[PDB]
């Protein structure tokens, strides 16, 4: 009868944050300290956290101390998990656990566990854009641009010909691909007579992977 | 089960302008009412609440009044740094109801917008994957439809699309969309097409290309 | 000056689960009922569930009724939303927000707001495998055995079931543990040995069901 | 913050075996050690508890014994679903600690794995993708390691392996390894090989091929 199901487990970058909540059948955790636990790949149980009765004592493992917070909730029966500045380590299968027996006493063993979540923290915490041209060819106004696509996290910058060109330039707001990364086109608007003789390069900068990227569009 | 309903839901205007934002409930809420003014990617600001008073720091040109079931936000005097939107709020003990919102922004005349076509540049083909790019430029008002065709079968599900702030100095906006598929599915089709719908059109645009060319 | 800051917004599939999270600076939650609202694509704001000091009361938009839970830990100062059942008009941004005012009373509006964190469900809750042949080589045949698979890429979620010629054919194979990719999608492969004496006058054909999304396909493996 | 040392890490043992796995804690616990069973995909299953105490519904074959710093869990009469995990655990009023875990798998003789190597199939290549893959069929027992070297230099972080579970005729596991390159990046390079390491084999074994045959 007495069961408890994990939620929220997902996949992460390192560095981001996840949090996993708890809920149980059958019975309150009012009156037990519970517990979550972790399985990393290689097979072997982790103790991670303990939040006692009425939350007077939390506990964690060395290893997420400053980065993990668990947190009970009485009145609904739940228990969350906070994970922050994840790292691949923390990997893992989470489960809730409850510490209970027939009759409670000031220590007992884990005597009911989760089915668990599967938690995946991927190694690269950011990764730099690929720039691409987007080529000109209504005559006399031409347009051309940048598409700068699949980086992360935000944000990138964009100038044109390091800056000198500011005058009909546009920088659309990123949007987030089904994929999980970011992209964004940056287009300028042009005398239909320039294309070859003047040159046109778009600069992007991308600070949180240190990637700075120029590009020259050329017609065709 | 109050229901918020604000007017009108854009309101175009001049620096200089007084306007003025009506917000209507469903039933009577007293002087339980409350505005907030939010910018593009910022959290909301609360300016006014007890549908009368301001909060510390709000300039003296924003005022609001009403009770029961209909309340004003009045600004005298719009500046710059006003160009926003504003939500009202029926807020209760232990929940609260929003209307719709209101962007006010700088008024000036229709313009249609100029479309542009860009096919996938042959490198990131390479890589397995097609986007192509339709931009709508400088136009007004800011509502605008794109409708992704290939080989003139209507697209969704594979598009998506941002539109720029208002101009800083013509006072337009632009848009831009992408259509993505795998560079399978791009050469399984000849004709790319975007097709535009805005009021500054008699009718819908095409640009297109033919795949190859 | 007192702040809000929301963490966990991300992509979902569709029928998915998230959980948010709300921690403060330079005050503490218990004396306030705390809340959470969203900005839909639309523009407008949204309110979507209060709960008051004490965990007295928990209240819900009708929209999330059912879907959504929202806790409170007055101890450490955070605030919760879980989210569950996630539907694509679930796709905003969430702030959590405090209902307060200089001097507290039974009903004041939201004075300060966290920056928001974007959370955006997807409709598509399942997604279809790619199959690419593990092709029988001289690299992958030695003696009188000869070796060949099927690679089952870029599918969500778990799992897929993988047969060779129908059922045929059981003797020899097998079909690993899938695996995660950074993608967020799965992989796994099927193999199978079979003798080289075979190649040429035997088909080989990976049947793959990928239930969920209730996608089948059969993938003839042949030489070169 | 006690340390506790299971052993062995692999216990390999036939049906009808009586076994005995210890756990060793790194300073005196008195009684607070429990024992738990964990199959593959499951939730862990309290077997025992304060050393010694068998929980109702537990097979009277599970024995566990010990105090201070010395526990064990003994099975006498080792059944087929015997075989999994077992964990021991210091308990404490608010914190615990882990053994290793002690995996049960069926004893056999060592087995050398046959290696075969594949290239990415075209079809995928024009997708932009390279999966390489390497499989380690039949071997025993289950450590084996697997390197991939492109052109001679050893590979770091674009690889993932899966293990099968023991093969219920031979009792053999299986290891896929998929070496993953963007189409670009698979271009740049000529010789893919993928060296096994096992007890079985004299030495290591490596297979590779030229790109572009
Ligand atoms: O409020 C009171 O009733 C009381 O006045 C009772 C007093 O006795 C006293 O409680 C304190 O001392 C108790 C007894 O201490 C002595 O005897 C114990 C044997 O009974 C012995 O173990 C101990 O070493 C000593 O010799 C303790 O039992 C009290 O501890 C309980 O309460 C505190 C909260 O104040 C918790 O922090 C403890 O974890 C413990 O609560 C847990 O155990 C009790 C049963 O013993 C459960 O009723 C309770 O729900 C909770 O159980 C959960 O947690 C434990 C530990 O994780 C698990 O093993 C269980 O399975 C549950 O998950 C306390 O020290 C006074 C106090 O002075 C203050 O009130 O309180
Ligand atoms: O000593 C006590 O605690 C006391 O004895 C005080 C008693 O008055 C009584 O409290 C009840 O009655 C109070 C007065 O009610 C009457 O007058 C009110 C006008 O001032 C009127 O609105 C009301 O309808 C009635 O006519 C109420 O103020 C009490 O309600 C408060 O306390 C209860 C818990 O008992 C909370 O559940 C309420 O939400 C409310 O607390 C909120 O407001 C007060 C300020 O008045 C804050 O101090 C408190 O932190 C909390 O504030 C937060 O939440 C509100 C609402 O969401 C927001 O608007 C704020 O911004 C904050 O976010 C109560 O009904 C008795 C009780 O009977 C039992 O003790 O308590």
């Known amino acids: 009868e007495v069961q408890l199901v994990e939620s929220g487990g997902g996949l992460v970058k390192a560095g981001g944050s996840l949090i996993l909540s708890c809920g149980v059948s059958?019975?309150?955790?009012?009156?037990?300290?519970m517990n979550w636990v972790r399985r990393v790949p290689g097979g072997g149980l982790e103790w991670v956290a303990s939040?006692?009765?009425?939350?007077?004592?939390?506990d964690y493992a060395d290893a997420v101390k400053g980065r993990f917070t668990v947190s009970r909730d009485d009145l609904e029966d739940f228990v969350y998990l906070q994970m922050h500045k994840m790292r691949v380590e923390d990997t893992a299968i989470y489960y809730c656990?409850?510490?209970?027996?027939?009759?409670?006493?000031?220590?007992?063993?884990?005597?009911?566990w989760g089915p668990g979540t599967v938690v995946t923290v991927s190694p690269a915490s950011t990764k730099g854009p690929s720039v691409f041209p987007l080529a000109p060819s209504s005559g006399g106004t031409a347009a051309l641009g940048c598409l700068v696509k699949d980086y992360f996290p935000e944000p990138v910058t964009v100038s044109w010909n390091s800056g000198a060109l500011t005058s009909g330039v546009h920088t659309f707001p990123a949007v987030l691909q089904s994929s999980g990364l970011y992209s964004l086109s940056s287009v300028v608007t042009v005398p239909s007579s320039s294309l070859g003789t003047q040159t046109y390069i778009c600069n992007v900068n991308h600070k949180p992977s240190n990637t700075k990227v120029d590009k020259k569009v050329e017609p065709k | 089960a109050v229901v918020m309903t604000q007017s009108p839901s854009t309101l175009s205007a001049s620096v200089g302008d007084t306007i003025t934002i009506t917000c209507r409930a469903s039933q009577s809420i007293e002087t339980w009412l409350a505005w907030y003014q939010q910018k593009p990617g910022k959290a909301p600001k609360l300016?006014?609440?007890?549908?009368?008073?301001?909060?510390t720091g709000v300039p003296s040109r924003f005022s609001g009044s009403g009770s029961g079931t209909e309340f004003t936000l009045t600004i005298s005097g719009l500046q710059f740094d006003d160009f926003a939107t504003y939500h009202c709020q029926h807020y209760a003990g232990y929940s609260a109801t929003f209307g719709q919102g209101t962007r006010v922004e700088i008024k000036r005349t229709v313009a249609a917008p100029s479309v542009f076509i860009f096919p996938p540049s042959d490198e990131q083909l390479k890589s397995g994957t097609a986007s192509v790019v339709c931009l709508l430029n400088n136009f007004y008002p800011r509502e605008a439809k794109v409708q992704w065709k290939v080989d003139n079968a209507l697209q969704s599900g594979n598009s998506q699309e941002s539109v720029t702030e208002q101009d800083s100095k013509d006072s337009t906006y632009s848009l831009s969309s992408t259509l993505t598929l795998s560079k399978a599915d791009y050469e399984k089709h000849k004709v790319y097409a975007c097709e535009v719908t805005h009021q500054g059109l008699s009718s819908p645009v095409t640009k297109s290309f033919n795949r190859g060319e | 000056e007192v702040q809000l800051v929301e963490s966990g917004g991300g992509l979902v599939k569709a029928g998915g689960s998230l959980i948010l999270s709300c921690?403060?600076?330079?005050?503490?939650?218990?004396?306030?009922?705390?809340?959470?609202v969203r900005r839909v694509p639309g523009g407008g704001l949204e309110w979507?569930?209060?709960?008051?000091?004490?965990?007295?009361?928990?209240?819900?938009?009708d929209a999330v009724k059912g879907r959504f839970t929202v806790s409170r830990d007055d101890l450490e100062d955070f605030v919760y939303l879980q989210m569950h059942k996630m539907r694509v008009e679930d796709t905003a941004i969430?702030?959590?927000?405090?209902?307060?005012?200089?001097?507290?009373?039974?009903?004041?509006?939201?004075?300060?707001?966290?920056?928001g964190t974007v959370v955006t469900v997807s409709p598509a809750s399942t997604k279809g495998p790619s199959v690419f042949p593990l092709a029988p080589s001289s690299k992958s045949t030695s003696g009188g055995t000869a070796a060949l698979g099927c690679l089952v890429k870029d599918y969500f979620p778990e799992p897929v079931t993988v047969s060779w010629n129908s059922g045929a054919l059981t003797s020899g194979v097998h079909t690993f543990p899938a695996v995660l990719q950074s993608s967020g999608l799965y992989s796994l492969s099927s193999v199978v040995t079979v003798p080289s004496s075979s190649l040429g006058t035997q088909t080989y054909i990976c049947n793959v069901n990928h239930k969920p999304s209730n996608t089948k396909v059969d993938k003839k493996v042949e030489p070169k | 913050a006690v340390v506790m040392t299971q052993s062995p890490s692999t216990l390999s043992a036939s049906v009808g075996d009586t076994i005995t796995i210890t756990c060793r804690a790194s300073q005196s616990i008195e009684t607070w050690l429990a024992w738990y069973q964990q199959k593959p995909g499951k939730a862990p299953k309290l077997l025992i508890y304060?050393?010694?105490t068998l929980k109702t519904g537990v097979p009277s074959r599970f024995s566990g014994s010990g105090s201070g710093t010395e526990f064990t869990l003994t099975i006498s009469g080792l059944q087929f679903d015997d075989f999994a995990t077992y964990h021991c655990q210091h308990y404490a009023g608010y914190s615990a600690t882990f053994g290793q875990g002690t995996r049960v798998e069926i004893k056999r003789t060592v087995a050398a794995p046959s290696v075969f190597i594949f290239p990415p199939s075209d079809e995928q290549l024009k997708s932009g993708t390279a999966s390489v893959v390497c499989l380690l069929n039949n071997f025993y027992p289950r450590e084996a390691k697997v390197q991939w070297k492109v052109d001679n230099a050893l590979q770091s972080g674009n690889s993932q392996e899966s293990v099968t579970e023991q093969d219920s005729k031979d009792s053999t596991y299986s290891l896929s390894s998929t070496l993953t390159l963007s189409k670009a990046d698979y271009e740049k390079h000529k010789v893919y090989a993928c060296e096994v390491t096992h007890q079985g084999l004299s030495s290591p074994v490596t297979k590779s091929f030229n790109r572009g045959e």
């Open positions: 059958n019975f309150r955790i009012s009156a037990h300290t």
């Open positions: 304060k050393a010694s």
């Open positions: 939040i006692s009765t009425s939350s007077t004592y939390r």
């Open positions: 656990a409850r510490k209970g027996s027939d009759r409670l006493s000031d220590n007992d063993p884990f005597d009911a």
